[PDB]
Amino acid sequence: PTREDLVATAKLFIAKYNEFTPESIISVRTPNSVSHRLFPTRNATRNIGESMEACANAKEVFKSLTVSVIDDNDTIVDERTRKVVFYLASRGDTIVGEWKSECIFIFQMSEDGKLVDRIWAGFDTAYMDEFESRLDGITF
Amino acid sequence: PTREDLVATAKLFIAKYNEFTPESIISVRTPNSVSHRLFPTRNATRNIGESMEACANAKEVFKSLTVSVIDDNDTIVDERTRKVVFYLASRGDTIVGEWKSECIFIFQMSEDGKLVDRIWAGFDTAYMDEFESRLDGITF
Ligand SMILES: COC(=O)[C@@](C)(O)C(=O)[C@]1(C)C(C)=C[C@H]2[C@]3(C)CCC(=O)C(C)(C)[C@H]3C(=O)[C@@H](O)[C@]2(C)[C@H]1C(=O)O
Ligand SMILES: COC(=O)[C@@](C)(O)C(=O)[C@]1(C)C(C)=C[C@H]2[C@]3(C)CCC(=O)C(C)(C)[C@H]3C(=O)[C@@H](O)[C@]2(C)[C@H]1C(=O)O
Ligand SMILES: [Ca+2]
Ligand SMILES: [Ca+2]
Ligand SMILES: [Ca+2]
C-alpha cells in the first residue's frame, strides 16, 4: 500500500467514527484488531466487542461527538510499518456539558492497507479526569 | 536522510535529553527549533532559550531523569516528512520522590537529518497534575 492508500484508510476510519454507532466504529477495523489507550492513568485495551460496548456506553452520555484531523500537514505516515498518525480535534455535547479536547490517534493498517489492524489513542488525561468528575457528580 | 539516519538523530536527542542540562537538551536542536506540547491542558511552546530556562527550573525538582524507548518495534519513521515517533517510559528522582510515567515524542529532523528542527511532546496530563499536587504538599 502507498502512502496515499494508508491515509485514505485512516480517513475512512475517521468518517465512520463520526457516525458514532457500534456498527460504524468497527466498520474499518480487522475483527481481531485491538484499540489501545496510551498513558498509565488511562491505559486500556479493547477488542471489537469491547469497542462496540464502549461506544454504546459513550452514547448514553454523549449527545453527539465528532473528531477531525486538524491539519493534514501534521499527519505522519510510515509505509514500512503501515502506520499513520493523526492529531485530532474532538467536539461534542453531553449530559454534563460540552466536550472539547484534542487527541493523537496512531493506526497500523492491515497488510493490504485497506483496514485498521491496531489503534493507539493518546488523550488529554487531565481533561478526561475532569469530565469523569462531572459524570461522578450526577445528582437528581 | 535514510530511515536509520532519522532514528539515530532522534536517539541522540534522547541520550542528551537524559544528561539533562540546559546545554545538553538543546545540543541536538537547530537554532530556530521549537518544542510543542500536545493537548490543551498543558499546552506550551518553547524556543531554544525558553527550553534552556525550563530545564534549569525543572532541575530544581528532578534530581535525575531517564526517558527510554519502550519498544523499538513501535517506533514510527516517516522518511518523507523526516519525522520519528517514540513511545517512551519516563523515570525521575525528584524532591518529592519517584516520578514514573510515559510520553510520546515526535521529532522532525532538519533537511540533512542531523538535528531536531521541531518537537512535539504528549505527556500524561493527569499524572502531571498528580505530581504538582505532590509538590504542593511539601511540608517542613
Ligand atoms: C480509544 O480509541 C477509540 O476512540 C476507539 C477506537 O477505541 C473507540 O472505538 C471508542 C469506543 C470510541 C468510539 C470513542 C472513544 C471516546 C468516547 C471518544 C471521545 C473521547 O475523547 C473520549 C476520550 C471520551 C473517548 C473515550 O473515552 C474512548 O475510550 C472511546 C469510548 C473509544 C475506546 O475504544 O476506548
Ligand atoms: C518535551 O520536553 C522537551 O523537549 C522540553 C523542550 O520541553 C525540555 O527541554 C524540558 C526542559 C525537558 C528537558 C524536560 C521536561 C520534563 C522534565 C521531562 C520529564 C517529564 O515527563 C516532564 C513532563 C516532567 C517534563 C516537563 O515538565 C517539561 O516541562 C520539561 C522540564 C521540558 C520543558 O519544560 O520544556
Ligand atoms: Ca451503560
Ligand atoms: Ca468514576
Ligand atoms: Ca503548584
Swiss-Prot record, chains A, B:
UniProt note: phenotype after gene disruption: Impairs the synthesis of terretonin but accumulates terretonin C.
Chain positions recorded as substrate binding sites: Y17, R37, R46
Effect of Y17F: Alters the stereochemistry and the specificity of the enzyme reaction
InterPro entries, sorted: Fungal_Meroterpenoid_Isomerase
Entry EC number(s): 5.-.-.-
A Gene Ontology molecular function term of the record: isomerase activity
Region: Substrate, residue numbers: 35-37
Keyword list, A-Z: Isomerase
Enzyme category, top tier: isomerase
Reported effect, R29A: Does not significantly affect the catalytic activity
Cysteines engaged in disulfide bonds, as pairs: none
GO BP annotations listed: terpenoid biosynthetic process
Pathway of action: Secondary metabolite biosynthesis; terpenoid biosynthesis
Function recorded in the entry: Isomerase; part of the gene cluster that mediates the biosynthesis of terretonin, a fungal meroterpenoid that acts as a mycotoxin. The first step of the pathway is the synthesis of 3,5-dimethylorsellinic acid (DMOA) by the polyketide synthase trt4. DMOA is then prenylated into farnesyl-DMOA by the polyprenyl transferase trt2. Methylation by the methyltransferase trt5 then leads to farnesyl-DMOA methyl ester which is further subject to epoxidation by the FAD-dependent monooxygenase trt8 to yield epoxyfarnesyl-DMOA methyl ester.
Complexes and interactors: Homodimer.
Family, per entry: Belongs to the trt14 isomerase family.
The protein, known as: Isomerase trt14
Designated gene of the protein: trt14
